[PDB]
Every structure is written in structure tokens, then in C-alpha cells.
mmCIF file of C-alpha atoms and ligand atoms in Angstrom:
data_model
loop_
_atom_site.group_PDB
_atom_site.id
_atom_site.type_symbol
_atom_site.label_atom_id
_atom_site.label_comp_id
_atom_site.label_asym_id
_atom_site.label_seq_id
_atom_site.Cartn_x
_atom_site.Cartn_y
_atom_site.Cartn_z
ATOM 1 C CA UNK A 1 -4.434 19.280 -5.859
ATOM 2 C CA UNK A 2 -3.088 15.631 -7.115
ATOM 3 C CA UNK A 3 -0.120 16.420 -8.555
ATOM 4 C CA UNK A 4 0.780 12.457 -9.289
ATOM 5 C CA UNK A 5 0.547 9.131 -8.475
ATOM 6 C CA UNK A 6 2.644 6.276 -8.053
ATOM 7 C CA UNK A 7 2.264 2.288 -7.160
ATOM 8 C CA UNK A 8 5.085 -0.744 -7.281
ATOM 9 C CA UNK A 9 5.056 -4.122 -6.778
ATOM 10 C CA UNK A 10 8.349 -6.082 -5.797
ATOM 11 C CA UNK A 11 8.970 -9.749 -5.548
ATOM 12 C CA UNK A 12 11.410 -10.204 -2.647
ATOM 13 C CA UNK A 13 12.923 -13.663 -3.869
ATOM 14 C CA UNK A 14 13.599 -11.664 -7.197
ATOM 15 C CA UNK A 15 15.607 -9.024 -4.950
ATOM 16 C CA UNK A 16 17.334 -12.116 -2.905
ATOM 17 C CA UNK A 17 18.007 -13.382 -6.574
ATOM 18 C CA UNK A 18 19.558 -10.353 -7.756
ATOM 19 C CA UNK A 19 21.523 -9.729 -4.759
ATOM 20 C CA UNK A 20 23.435 -13.289 -5.081
ATOM 21 C CA UNK A 21 23.955 -12.253 -9.101
ATOM 22 C CA UNK A 22 25.322 -9.138 -8.475
ATOM 23 C CA UNK A 23 26.242 -8.257 -4.876
ATOM 24 C CA UNK A 24 25.615 -4.881 -4.117
ATOM 25 C CA UNK A 25 25.190 -3.291 -7.325
ATOM 26 C CA UNK A 26 21.490 -3.222 -6.906
ATOM 27 C CA UNK A 27 21.953 -1.545 -2.969
ATOM 28 C CA UNK A 28 23.848 1.099 -4.231
ATOM 29 C CA UNK A 29 21.777 1.823 -7.301
ATOM 30 C CA UNK A 30 18.698 2.276 -4.951
ATOM 31 C CA UNK A 31 19.801 2.913 -1.755
ATOM 32 C CA UNK A 32 21.266 6.924 -0.759
ATOM 33 C CA UNK A 33 24.676 7.031 0.520
ATOM 34 C CA UNK A 34 22.903 7.008 3.830
ATOM 35 C CA UNK A 35 20.564 4.116 3.428
ATOM 36 C CA UNK A 36 23.548 2.296 1.602
ATOM 37 C CA UNK A 37 25.253 2.486 5.023
ATOM 38 C CA UNK A 38 22.240 0.581 7.468
ATOM 39 C CA UNK A 39 21.695 -1.970 4.594
ATOM 40 C CA UNK A 40 25.188 -3.028 4.947
ATOM 41 C CA UNK A 41 24.820 -3.586 8.761
ATOM 42 C CA UNK A 42 20.830 -4.772 8.692
ATOM 43 C CA UNK A 43 20.012 -8.005 10.385
ATOM 44 C CA UNK A 44 17.283 -8.576 7.217
ATOM 45 C CA UNK A 45 19.039 -6.886 4.424
ATOM 46 C CA UNK A 46 16.614 -8.537 1.530
ATOM 47 C CA UNK A 47 13.518 -7.729 2.888
ATOM 48 C CA UNK A 48 14.722 -4.141 3.813
ATOM 49 C CA UNK A 49 16.042 -3.425 0.547
ATOM 50 C CA UNK A 50 13.296 -4.945 -1.510
ATOM 51 C CA UNK A 51 10.875 -2.790 1.006
ATOM 52 C CA UNK A 52 12.705 0.813 0.373
ATOM 53 C CA UNK A 53 12.629 0.002 -3.679
ATOM 54 C CA UNK A 54 8.987 -0.433 -3.717
ATOM 55 C CA UNK A 55 8.700 2.721 -1.792
ATOM 56 C CA UNK A 56 11.063 4.874 -3.562
ATOM 57 C CA UNK A 57 9.920 2.859 -7.393
ATOM 58 C CA UNK A 58 6.267 4.329 -6.047
ATOM 59 C CA UNK A 59 7.800 7.854 -5.177
ATOM 60 C CA UNK A 60 9.459 7.898 -8.619
ATOM 61 C CA UNK A 61 6.640 7.049 -10.478
ATOM 62 C CA UNK A 62 4.130 9.494 -8.357
ATOM 63 C CA UNK A 63 6.429 12.473 -9.518
ATOM 64 C CA UNK A 64 6.281 11.559 -13.124
ATOM 65 C CA UNK A 65 8.649 12.475 -15.435
ATOM 66 C CA UNK A 66 10.852 11.068 -17.887
ATOM 67 C CA UNK A 67 15.027 11.782 -18.267
ATOM 68 C CA UNK A 68 14.655 15.095 -18.399
ATOM 69 C CA UNK A 69 13.583 15.680 -14.596
ATOM 70 C CA UNK A 70 15.383 12.946 -13.266
ATOM 71 C CA UNK A 71 14.312 11.894 -9.602
ATOM 72 C CA UNK A 72 17.613 9.672 -9.039
ATOM 73 C CA UNK A 73 17.305 7.262 -5.746
ATOM 74 C CA UNK A 74 20.839 9.061 -4.626
ATOM 75 C CA UNK A 75 18.926 12.084 -4.135
ATOM 76 C CA UNK A 76 16.239 11.153 -2.171
ATOM 77 C CA UNK A 77 15.515 8.577 1.015
ATOM 78 C CA UNK A 78 13.018 6.730 3.285
ATOM 79 C CA UNK A 79 13.099 7.001 6.876
ATOM 80 C CA UNK A 80 10.581 6.024 9.613
ATOM 81 C CA UNK A 81 8.715 9.120 11.797
ATOM 82 C CA UNK A 82 7.852 8.263 15.488
ATOM 83 C CA UNK A 83 4.849 6.367 14.702
ATOM 84 C CA UNK A 84 6.800 3.963 12.043
ATOM 85 C CA UNK A 85 5.150 5.361 9.326
ATOM 86 C CA UNK A 86 7.298 5.912 6.131
ATOM 87 C CA UNK A 87 8.543 9.654 5.058
ATOM 88 C CA UNK A 88 10.379 10.856 2.391
ATOM 89 C CA UNK A 89 13.161 13.051 2.553
ATOM 90 C CA UNK A 90 14.243 15.139 -0.437
ATOM 91 C CA UNK A 91 17.858 17.083 -1.568
ATOM 92 C CA UNK A 92 19.218 18.333 -4.340
ATOM 93 C CA UNK A 93 17.525 17.808 -7.548
ATOM 94 C CA UNK A 94 14.526 15.611 -6.122
ATOM 95 C CA UNK A 95 13.964 18.706 -3.834
ATOM 96 C CA UNK A 96 14.217 21.216 -6.764
ATOM 97 C CA UNK A 97 11.669 19.346 -8.898
ATOM 98 C CA UNK A 98 9.492 18.651 -5.764
ATOM 99 C CA UNK A 99 9.881 22.666 -5.371
ATOM 100 C CA UNK A 100 9.330 22.992 -9.210
ATOM 101 C CA UNK A 101 6.211 20.992 -9.350
ATOM 102 C CA UNK A 102 4.510 22.862 -6.321
ATOM 103 C CA UNK A 103 4.704 19.663 -4.230
ATOM 104 C CA UNK A 104 3.071 20.794 -0.618
ATOM 105 C CA UNK A 105 2.339 17.282 0.584
ATOM 106 C CA UNK A 106 3.528 13.818 0.291
ATOM 107 C CA UNK A 107 1.340 10.591 1.482
ATOM 108 C CA UNK A 108 2.963 7.350 1.475
ATOM 109 C CA UNK A 109 1.917 4.251 2.701
ATOM 110 C CA UNK A 110 3.988 0.354 2.445
ATOM 111 C CA UNK A 111 3.025 -3.237 2.851
ATOM 112 C CA UNK A 112 4.389 -6.019 3.116
ATOM 113 C CA UNK A 113 3.860 -10.372 2.495
ATOM 114 C CA UNK A 114 6.330 -12.807 3.033
ATOM 115 C CA UNK A 115 6.886 -12.816 -0.949
ATOM 116 C CA UNK A 116 5.883 -9.435 -1.630
ATOM 117 C CA UNK A 117 6.117 -5.683 -1.056
ATOM 118 C CA UNK A 118 3.992 -3.233 -2.122
ATOM 119 C CA UNK A 119 3.951 0.716 -1.700
ATOM 120 C CA UNK A 120 1.859 3.654 -2.943
ATOM 121 C CA UNK A 121 2.775 7.578 -2.931
ATOM 122 C CA UNK A 122 0.574 10.497 -3.441
ATOM 123 C CA UNK A 123 2.292 13.887 -4.379
ATOM 124 C CA UNK A 124 -0.486 16.799 -3.736
ATOM 125 C CA UNK A 125 -0.173 20.521 -3.879
ATOM 126 C CA UNK B 1 -7.534 17.655 0.852
ATOM 127 C CA UNK B 2 -6.037 14.097 1.419
ATOM 128 C CA UNK B 3 -5.814 13.702 5.183
ATOM 129 C CA UNK B 4 -3.926 9.932 4.811
ATOM 130 C CA UNK B 5 -3.772 7.156 2.509
ATOM 131 C CA UNK B 6 -3.357 3.453 3.445
ATOM 132 C CA UNK B 7 -2.547 0.395 1.947
ATOM 133 C CA UNK B 8 -2.394 -3.698 2.685
ATOM 134 C CA UNK B 9 -2.132 -7.080 1.090
ATOM 135 C CA UNK B 10 -2.884 -10.478 2.750
ATOM 136 C CA UNK B 11 -1.245 -13.855 1.799
ATOM 137 C CA UNK B 12 -4.459 -15.845 1.745
ATOM 138 C CA UNK B 13 -2.149 -19.411 2.698
ATOM 139 C CA UNK B 14 -0.796 -17.578 5.910
ATOM 140 C CA UNK B 15 -4.425 -16.732 7.192
ATOM 141 C CA UNK B 16 -5.497 -20.042 6.597
ATOM 142 C CA UNK B 17 -2.315 -21.212 8.553
ATOM 143 C CA UNK B 18 -3.139 -19.103 11.064
ATOM 144 C CA UNK B 19 -6.702 -20.573 11.365
ATOM 145 C CA UNK B 20 -5.292 -23.762 11.678
ATOM 146 C CA UNK B 21 -3.448 -22.849 14.798
ATOM 147 C CA UNK B 22 -5.086 -20.624 16.494
ATOM 148 C CA UNK B 23 -8.799 -21.070 15.325
ATOM 149 C CA UNK B 24 -11.175 -18.450 15.456
ATOM 150 C CA UNK B 25 -8.632 -15.962 17.447
ATOM 151 C CA UNK B 26 -7.615 -13.972 14.155
ATOM 152 C CA UNK B 27 -11.047 -13.390 13.462
ATOM 153 C CA UNK B 28 -12.248 -11.939 16.794
ATOM 154 C CA UNK B 29 -9.832 -10.244 16.720
ATOM 155 C CA UNK B 30 -9.850 -8.287 13.169
ATOM 156 C CA UNK B 31 -13.845 -8.523 12.496
ATOM 157 C CA UNK B 32 -16.717 -6.720 14.649
ATOM 158 C CA UNK B 33 -19.466 -8.327 16.327
ATOM 159 C CA UNK B 34 -21.567 -7.812 13.231
ATOM 160 C CA UNK B 35 -18.819 -8.791 10.792
ATOM 161 C CA UNK B 36 -18.384 -12.047 13.174
ATOM 162 C CA UNK B 37 -21.767 -13.304 13.119
ATOM 163 C CA UNK B 38 -21.228 -13.342 8.975
ATOM 164 C CA UNK B 39 -17.868 -15.256 8.814
ATOM 165 C CA UNK B 40 -19.202 -17.847 11.208
ATOM 166 C CA UNK B 41 -21.982 -19.094 8.355
ATOM 167 C CA UNK B 42 -19.853 -17.791 5.384
ATOM 168 C CA UNK B 43 -19.103 -20.223 2.628
ATOM 169 C CA UNK B 44 -15.840 -18.859 2.263
ATOM 170 C CA UNK B 45 -14.716 -17.883 5.717
ATOM 171 C CA UNK B 46 -10.743 -18.260 4.816
ATOM 172 C CA UNK B 47 -11.205 -15.648 2.271
ATOM 173 C CA UNK B 48 -13.796 -13.553 3.713
ATOM 174 C CA UNK B 49 -11.458 -12.867 6.369
ATOM 175 C CA UNK B 50 -8.483 -12.165 4.435
ATOM 176 C CA UNK B 51 -10.328 -9.010 2.391
ATOM 177 C CA UNK B 52 -11.673 -7.872 5.522
ATOM 178 C CA UNK B 53 -8.614 -7.962 7.433
ATOM 179 C CA UNK B 54 -6.497 -5.956 4.445
ATOM 180 C CA UNK B 55 -9.544 -3.225 4.147
ATOM 181 C CA UNK B 56 -9.425 -2.895 7.878
ATOM 182 C CA UNK B 57 -5.520 -2.650 8.166
ATOM 183 C CA UNK B 58 -5.532 -0.127 5.129
ATOM 184 C CA UNK B 59 -7.951 2.052 6.781
ATOM 185 C CA UNK B 60 -5.999 2.181 10.296
ATOM 186 C CA UNK B 61 -2.744 3.019 8.155
ATOM 187 C CA UNK B 62 -4.724 6.071 6.331
ATOM 188 C CA UNK B 63 -5.672 7.480 10.042
ATOM 189 C CA UNK B 64 -2.301 6.642 11.010
ATOM 190 C CA UNK B 65 -3.167 7.736 14.241
ATOM 191 C CA UNK B 66 -0.531 8.243 17.208
ATOM 192 C CA UNK B 67 -3.487 7.282 19.340
ATOM 193 C CA UNK B 68 -2.281 3.845 21.206
ATOM 194 C CA UNK B 69 -4.919 1.723 19.447
ATOM 195 C CA UNK B 70 -6.929 4.732 18.443
ATOM 196 C CA UNK B 71 -8.614 3.043 14.948
ATOM 197 C CA UNK B 72 -9.231 -0.258 16.897
ATOM 198 C CA UNK B 73 -10.586 -3.269 14.440
ATOM 199 C CA UNK B 74 -13.650 -3.758 16.860
ATOM 200 C CA UNK B 75 -15.109 -0.283 16.309
ATOM 201 C CA UNK B 76 -15.465 -0.074 12.602
ATOM 202 C CA UNK B 77 -16.693 -2.220 9.807
ATOM 203 C CA UNK B 78 -16.656 -2.631 6.194
ATOM 204 C CA UNK B 79 -19.772 -3.275 4.066
ATOM 205 C CA UNK B 80 -20.867 -2.401 0.095
ATOM 206 C CA UNK B 81 -23.303 0.206 -1.334
ATOM 207 C CA UNK B 82 -25.653 -0.260 -4.208
ATOM 208 C CA UNK B 83 -22.646 0.515 -6.161
ATOM 209 C CA UNK B 84 -20.807 -2.141 -5.111
ATOM 210 C CA UNK B 85 -17.932 0.138 -3.375
ATOM 211 C CA UNK B 86 -16.624 -0.836 -0.148
ATOM 212 C CA UNK B 87 -17.658 1.512 2.826
ATOM 213 C CA UNK B 88 -16.483 1.962 6.224
ATOM 214 C CA UNK B 89 -18.686 2.400 9.625
ATOM 215 C CA UNK B 90 -17.032 3.698 12.643
ATOM 216 C CA UNK B 91 -18.561 4.340 15.852
ATOM 217 C CA UNK B 92 -17.413 4.824 19.567
ATOM 218 C CA UNK B 93 -13.265 6.229 19.473
ATOM 219 C CA UNK B 94 -13.204 5.386 15.778
ATOM 220 C CA UNK B 95 -15.751 7.704 14.984
ATOM 221 C CA UNK B 96 -14.640 10.592 17.587
ATOM 222 C CA UNK B 97 -10.912 10.280 15.266
ATOM 223 C CA UNK B 98 -12.543 10.853 12.525
ATOM 224 C CA UNK B 99 -14.553 13.569 13.970
ATOM 225 C CA UNK B 100 -11.154 15.458 15.073
ATOM 226 C CA UNK B 101 -9.353 14.505 11.991
ATOM 227 C CA UNK B 102 -11.939 16.426 9.973
ATOM 228 C CA UNK B 103 -12.682 13.252 7.508
ATOM 229 C CA UNK B 104 -15.385 14.153 5.270
ATOM 230 C CA UNK B 105 -14.909 11.233 3.012
ATOM 231 C CA UNK B 106 -13.248 7.593 2.999
ATOM 232 C CA UNK B 107 -12.771 6.090 -0.187
ATOM 233 C CA UNK B 108 -11.962 2.039 -0.016
ATOM 234 C CA UNK B 109 -10.795 -0.217 -2.310
ATOM 235 C CA UNK B 110 -10.144 -3.549 -2.289
ATOM 236 C CA UNK B 111 -9.204 -6.640 -4.822
ATOM 237 C CA UNK B 112 -7.939 -10.670 -4.340
ATOM 238 C CA UNK B 113 -6.735 -13.056 -6.590
ATOM 239 C CA UNK B 114 -6.922 -16.772 -5.728
ATOM 240 C CA UNK B 115 -3.079 -16.162 -3.537
ATOM 241 C CA UNK B 116 -3.466 -12.505 -2.451
ATOM 242 C CA UNK B 117 -5.994 -9.745 -1.252
ATOM 243 C CA UNK B 118 -5.221 -6.183 -1.839
ATOM 244 C CA UNK B 119 -6.703 -2.787 -0.204
ATOM 245 C CA UNK B 120 -6.180 0.588 -0.402
ATOM 246 C CA UNK B 121 -8.176 3.978 1.853
ATOM 247 C CA UNK B 122 -7.535 7.338 1.115
ATOM 248 C CA UNK B 123 -9.268 9.447 3.679
ATOM 249 C CA UNK B 124 -9.698 13.083 2.307
ATOM 250 C CA UNK B 125 -11.028 16.490 4.000
ATOM 251 C CA UNK C 1 -11.919 16.478 -5.088
ATOM 252 C CA UNK C 2 -11.382 12.669 -5.453
ATOM 253 C CA UNK C 3 -14.654 11.550 -7.260
ATOM 254 C CA UNK C 4 -13.530 7.722 -6.704
ATOM 255 C CA UNK C 5 -10.458 5.275 -6.280
ATOM 256 C CA UNK C 6 -9.484 1.809 -7.613
ATOM 257 C CA UNK C 7 -7.032 -1.233 -7.204
ATOM 258 C CA UNK C 8 -6.657 -4.425 -8.716
ATOM 259 C CA UNK C 9 -4.217 -7.508 -9.046
ATOM 260 C CA UNK C 10 -4.148 -9.820 -11.704
ATOM 261 C CA UNK C 11 -2.546 -13.268 -11.113
ATOM 262 C CA UNK C 12 -0.586 -13.548 -14.677
ATOM 263 C CA UNK C 13 -0.760 -17.167 -14.784
ATOM 264 C CA UNK C 14 -4.649 -17.030 -14.541
ATOM 265 C CA UNK C 15 -4.968 -14.928 -17.538
ATOM 266 C CA UNK C 16 -2.527 -17.345 -19.414
ATOM 267 C CA UNK C 17 -4.606 -20.115 -18.198
ATOM 268 C CA UNK C 18 -7.826 -18.467 -19.701
ATOM 269 C CA UNK C 19 -6.051 -17.472 -23.092
ATOM 270 C CA UNK C 20 -5.182 -21.642 -23.293
ATOM 271 C CA UNK C 21 -9.091 -22.283 -22.676
ATOM 272 C CA UNK C 22 -10.350 -20.098 -25.131
ATOM 273 C CA UNK C 23 -7.726 -18.500 -27.139
ATOM 274 C CA UNK C 24 -8.165 -14.828 -28.698
ATOM 275 C CA UNK C 25 -11.812 -14.977 -26.504
ATOM 276 C CA UNK C 26 -10.526 -12.342 -23.997
ATOM 277 C CA UNK C 27 -8.501 -10.026 -25.248
ATOM 278 C CA UNK C 28 -11.416 -9.473 -28.004
ATOM 279 C CA UNK C 29 -13.887 -8.738 -24.717
ATOM 280 C CA UNK C 30 -11.834 -6.635 -22.728
ATOM 281 C CA UNK C 31 -9.301 -4.376 -25.189
ATOM 282 C CA UNK C 32 -10.417 -1.486 -27.298
ATOM 283 C CA UNK C 33 -9.142 -1.539 -31.328
ATOM 284 C CA UNK C 34 -5.941 0.104 -30.456
ATOM 285 C CA UNK C 35 -5.217 -2.074 -28.028
ATOM 286 C CA UNK C 36 -6.292 -5.436 -29.461
ATOM 287 C CA UNK C 37 -3.590 -3.973 -32.392
ATOM 288 C CA UNK C 38 -1.080 -3.984 -30.228
ATOM 289 C CA UNK C 39 -2.087 -7.152 -28.461
ATOM 290 C CA UNK C 40 -1.991 -8.953 -32.075
ATOM 291 C CA UNK C 41 1.490 -8.307 -32.452
ATOM 292 C CA UNK C 42 3.311 -7.732 -28.474
ATOM 293 C CA UNK C 43 6.510 -9.878 -27.713
ATOM 294 C CA UNK C 44 4.947 -10.593 -24.204
ATOM 295 C CA UNK C 45 0.997 -10.349 -25.241
ATOM 296 C CA UNK C 46 0.041 -12.474 -22.175
ATOM 297 C CA UNK C 47 1.785 -9.865 -19.933
ATOM 298 C CA UNK C 48 0.471 -7.266 -21.910
ATOM 299 C CA UNK C 49 -3.453 -8.405 -21.603
ATOM 300 C CA UNK C 50 -3.006 -9.163 -18.150
ATOM 301 C CA UNK C 51 -1.594 -5.004 -16.935
ATOM 302 C CA UNK C 52 -4.348 -3.728 -19.303
ATOM 303 C CA UNK C 53 -6.498 -6.073 -17.131
ATOM 304 C CA UNK C 54 -5.714 -4.654 -14.133
ATOM 305 C CA UNK C 55 -6.204 -1.262 -14.890
ATOM 306 C CA UNK C 56 -9.498 -1.592 -16.323
ATOM 307 C CA UNK C 57 -10.795 -3.296 -13.197
ATOM 308 C CA UNK C 58 -9.126 -0.475 -11.195
ATOM 309 C CA UNK C 59 -10.616 2.239 -12.976
ATOM 310 C CA UNK C 60 -14.330 0.389 -13.393
ATOM 311 C CA UNK C 61 -14.120 0.362 -9.273
ATOM 312 C CA UNK C 62 -12.976 3.991 -8.952
ATOM 313 C CA UNK C 63 -16.072 5.069 -11.475
ATOM 314 C CA UNK C 64 -18.424 2.960 -9.641
ATOM 315 C CA UNK C 65 -19.092 -0.953 -10.973
ATOM 316 C CA UNK C 66 -22.785 -1.267 -10.102
ATOM 317 C CA UNK C 67 -23.438 2.074 -11.289
ATOM 318 C CA UNK C 68 -24.710 1.491 -14.418
ATOM 319 C CA UNK C 69 -25.050 -1.548 -17.744
ATOM 320 C CA UNK C 70 -23.433 -0.592 -20.836
ATOM 321 C CA UNK C 71 -20.256 -0.230 -19.189
ATOM 322 C CA UNK C 72 -17.554 -2.374 -20.624
ATOM 323 C CA UNK C 73 -13.676 -2.591 -20.274
ATOM 324 C CA UNK C 74 -13.143 -1.935 -24.227
ATOM 325 C CA UNK C 75 -14.275 1.547 -23.218
ATOM 326 C CA UNK C 76 -11.205 2.195 -20.432
ATOM 327 C CA UNK C 77 -8.671 1.952 -23.405
ATOM 328 C CA UNK C 78 -5.082 2.632 -22.024
ATOM 329 C CA UNK C 79 -1.984 3.975 -24.066
ATOM 330 C CA UNK C 80 1.302 5.073 -23.665
ATOM 331 C CA UNK C 81 1.734 8.875 -23.595
ATOM 332 C CA UNK C 82 5.087 10.103 -25.219
ATOM 333 C CA UNK C 83 7.255 10.076 -21.800
ATOM 334 C CA UNK C 84 5.576 5.643 -21.213
ATOM 335 C CA UNK C 85 3.368 6.495 -18.714
ATOM 336 C CA UNK C 86 -0.131 4.653 -18.853
ATOM 337 C CA UNK C 87 -2.885 7.179 -19.579
ATOM 338 C CA UNK C 88 -7.276 6.427 -20.038
ATOM 339 C CA UNK C 89 -8.828 7.650 -23.075
ATOM 340 C CA UNK C 90 -12.387 7.014 -22.650
ATOM 341 C CA UNK C 91 -15.198 5.483 -25.040
ATOM 342 C CA UNK C 92 -19.061 5.207 -25.390
ATOM 343 C CA UNK C 93 -20.799 4.971 -22.358
ATOM 344 C CA UNK C 94 -17.553 5.460 -20.261
ATOM 345 C CA UNK C 95 -16.649 8.824 -21.665
ATOM 346 C CA UNK C 96 -20.360 9.976 -21.019
ATOM 347 C CA UNK C 97 -20.462 8.850 -17.642
ATOM 348 C CA UNK C 98 -17.172 10.473 -16.733
ATOM 349 C CA UNK C 99 -18.903 13.747 -18.008
ATOM 350 C CA UNK C 100 -21.748 13.623 -16.156
ATOM 351 C CA UNK C 101 -19.730 12.784 -12.972
ATOM 352 C CA UNK C 102 -17.401 15.957 -13.964
ATOM 353 C CA UNK C 103 -14.334 14.367 -14.117
ATOM 354 C CA UNK C 104 -11.603 16.488 -14.889
ATOM 355 C CA UNK C 105 -8.596 14.317 -14.146
ATOM 356 C CA UNK C 106 -7.596 10.667 -14.369
ATOM 357 C CA UNK C 107 -4.876 8.976 -12.648
ATOM 358 C CA UNK C 108 -3.538 5.979 -13.420
ATOM 359 C CA UNK C 109 -0.533 3.952 -11.878
ATOM 360 C CA UNK C 110 0.565 0.206 -13.134
ATOM 361 C CA UNK C 111 2.998 -2.255 -11.804
ATOM 362 C CA UNK C 112 4.205 -6.017 -12.267
ATOM 363 C CA UNK C 113 6.345 -8.411 -11.255
ATOM 364 C CA UNK C 114 6.726 -11.729 -12.564
ATOM 365 C CA UNK C 115 3.315 -13.330 -11.130
ATOM 366 C CA UNK C 116 1.427 -10.668 -10.826
ATOM 367 C CA UNK C 117 0.108 -6.945 -12.134
ATOM 368 C CA UNK C 118 -1.002 -4.666 -10.513
ATOM 369 C CA UNK C 119 -2.789 -1.186 -10.855
ATOM 370 C CA UNK C 120 -4.593 2.209 -8.907
ATOM 371 C CA UNK C 121 -6.889 4.700 -10.564
ATOM 372 C CA UNK C 122 -7.931 7.842 -9.011
ATOM 373 C CA UNK C 123 -10.493 9.809 -10.847
ATOM 374 C CA UNK C 124 -10.776 13.898 -9.830
ATOM 375 C CA UNK C 125 -13.017 16.754 -10.106
HETATM 376 NA NA1 NA D 201 3.357 -13.350 0.444
HETATM 377 NA NA1 NA D 202 -6.965 -17.690 14.361
HETATM 378 NA NA1 NA D 203 -20.548 -8.776 3.196
HETATM 379 NA NA1 NA D 204 -22.344 -5.463 2.242
HETATM 380 NA NA1 NA D 205 -16.528 4.781 3.441
HETATM 381 NA NA1 NA D 206 -2.099 -17.544 -0.541
HETATM 382 NA NA1 NA D 207 -3.200 -15.188 -7.341
HETATM 383 NA NA1 NA D 208 -8.691 -16.422 -24.152
HETATM 384 NA NA1 NA D 209 6.084 -12.129 -9.496
#
């Protein structure tokens, strides 16, 4: 029943340094068009981006494919449900891959301390 | 089937600072009566509290309840079995919630370094 | 169904300090023959060893640390498949224990930042 498992850890100060070197580049690689617009106006953009990077990198690793099946970051996004829990929403080729794998349930968890954000994703049939 | 997933990370030095500001308040909030009695005489109270917080916060996220404070920290506790695996024991509304969700198994794992403790919890039917 | 869950976090500088004190001792203890051969010529050997330690401690916790004696980190070999995905290959008593437990699938995920490596392992029937 478990189709894949993924984890990530992000050092928030490293993302801050990346933004200072190359501006919006990291945000546009990692965020969807929708999420990019929220980062542009967020009050804690570095922490927002660090936590999203953690979730989306964990989700990409959970899907677990090489370049042949690229779950590009620009075809899925994270949102919070009514309880504040992170949830994944997929479209385009990202959603097509989930259908091909027979993904029936996705589990997402995220935590952050001052200096690090960590996330785990499990996809299941 | 996986019913929920939760993870947490705790910066031990942040817990140390919390204790310096407000004494036993954090311990009284996170620990059950039984766990409080061990903390009172523990040789590493800060680390004991940091690791229990990580496990119990991970566990609350795995239950992922919309019941306002449905998995209250004062209604469950952690112990180790003969294999060294951390285990959850629930009473009151916490146990009622577990029964309503149909929880048949609870998997808990915990790790700590000098500066951080982390934990992941999966509940399953 | 899930047979076990384990997580670990490794402070890389702690591994680096161990190596400065006792050289190859740690690597020779925890790594399998295959992993030892990579450690000897790796361009980032300390980071290699720290990440392997994270997987081996996570996998040990998943199987159950106090189960038996004669289990050892060098029997939890990690390798990369043709996609670069980390995978477990078991030898000796670890392989026997897996067969006794009815392990049908093993899921491994690993992530590293500059100061920490973390891993989670799930074994399943
Ligand atoms: Na921190
Ligand atoms: Na306190
Ligand atoms: Na204890
Ligand atoms: Na115990
Ligand atoms: Na348990
Ligand atoms: Na700390
Ligand atoms: Na540490
Ligand atoms: Na050594
Ligand atoms: Na780091």
C-alpha cells in the first residue's frame, strides 16, 4: 500500500543566503505561479519559502522518479486546509503521474524550528 | 491503511531558554502526571522534556483532529517497551478519539542530537 | 501493513570529531564491505559516513533495536539504484530477521543539509 516515502530538511539561513545572491530565482524554481504571488507579498518570505521547499522536495522524493517522470515543482502546490494542515494539489503532468502510480492517499507533515524546516510525505494506494 | 502522519523538531537550546523564563510551566503543559514525576528527578530534565515534546507534538499532528484540543497533552504519555521502541498510552478523550478514528496501530520513532530532537508518528488502521 | 518505523538525525560535526579522534575506526565498524570501498575514495567521506549512519540507525529502529544481539550496522547496507535512490540490502542476521518478520518492502529516505543528515525508514509486509 505504501507507494513512496520522502523527507527533507532545509536550513532557513541557507535559503536567506540564496535569496541574497540571486533574488527571486529560487522562489520561481520552487514555487508555482500561484505560490510565487503569495511569496511576493508575504511578511516572512524566507521562512515561507523554506517550509514550502521542504514540503515540495519531500513530495518529489516520495513520488520517487528520475528525469523520465519529472514531478516539476511548477505543476503542484501546497495549501493549508481548515485545520492548518498542509495538503498537496497536483495538475498537469504531476497529476497524470499520480494517476499512473495509482496514488489514492497522500500524507504530508511539516515542522519548523528557528533554523530548520523538516517535512515528510508518504504516498499510498 | 495510514490514518495520519506527524513529525516534529525541537531545538533544545530554545527549550532551555523557555525554562529559564517560565520555570516548570512548559513541563506542566506538555507532560502527563506520570511523566512530570520523572522529569522532577531526571538527570537531564531539559533533554527529557525536549524529547517528550517532540514525540507528543508529532503524535498530535498524526491524529490531526479538528476537535479543538482533542489530543490533549495531559491525556496521553510515552513509554519504552522491551525493544526500546517508544509507545503511546492514551486515556480519556484521547483514547476516545483513537477509537473513533479506528486506530489499530501507532508507530513512534524518536531521535536526538546535542542540539535537536526529532520524532515521527504514524497511526494506522 | 507497517512493520516498523525509524528516524535518525546526525550532527555531521559530531561524526567529523569522531574521525579526528580515532580515524577509520567508526567507518570500519558501521560500513559494509561495499560501503567501505566507497568511503575510502569518496570526495566527501565525512558527509558520506554521516548520511550512511543516519540510514543505519533509522533502519535499526524500524526493525527494533533491542530485538536480538548479533545485529550490527554493517548488515544494513545502503546502495544507490540506477536512479540515485538510496536502498537497503541486508546481510547476516539482519536478513534473517527481515525474513522472520515477513518484510516484503523497505522504504528509505535520506536528506542532508550542511550540518545535519536525517533519514526515515519504513518496513512493510
Ligand atoms: Na532551530
Ligand atoms: Na517553562
Ligand atoms: Na522514560
Ligand atoms: Na520507559
Ligand atoms: Na504506540
Ligand atoms: Na539547541
Ligand atoms: Na546536534
Ligand atoms: Na573513527
Ligand atoms: Na545545516
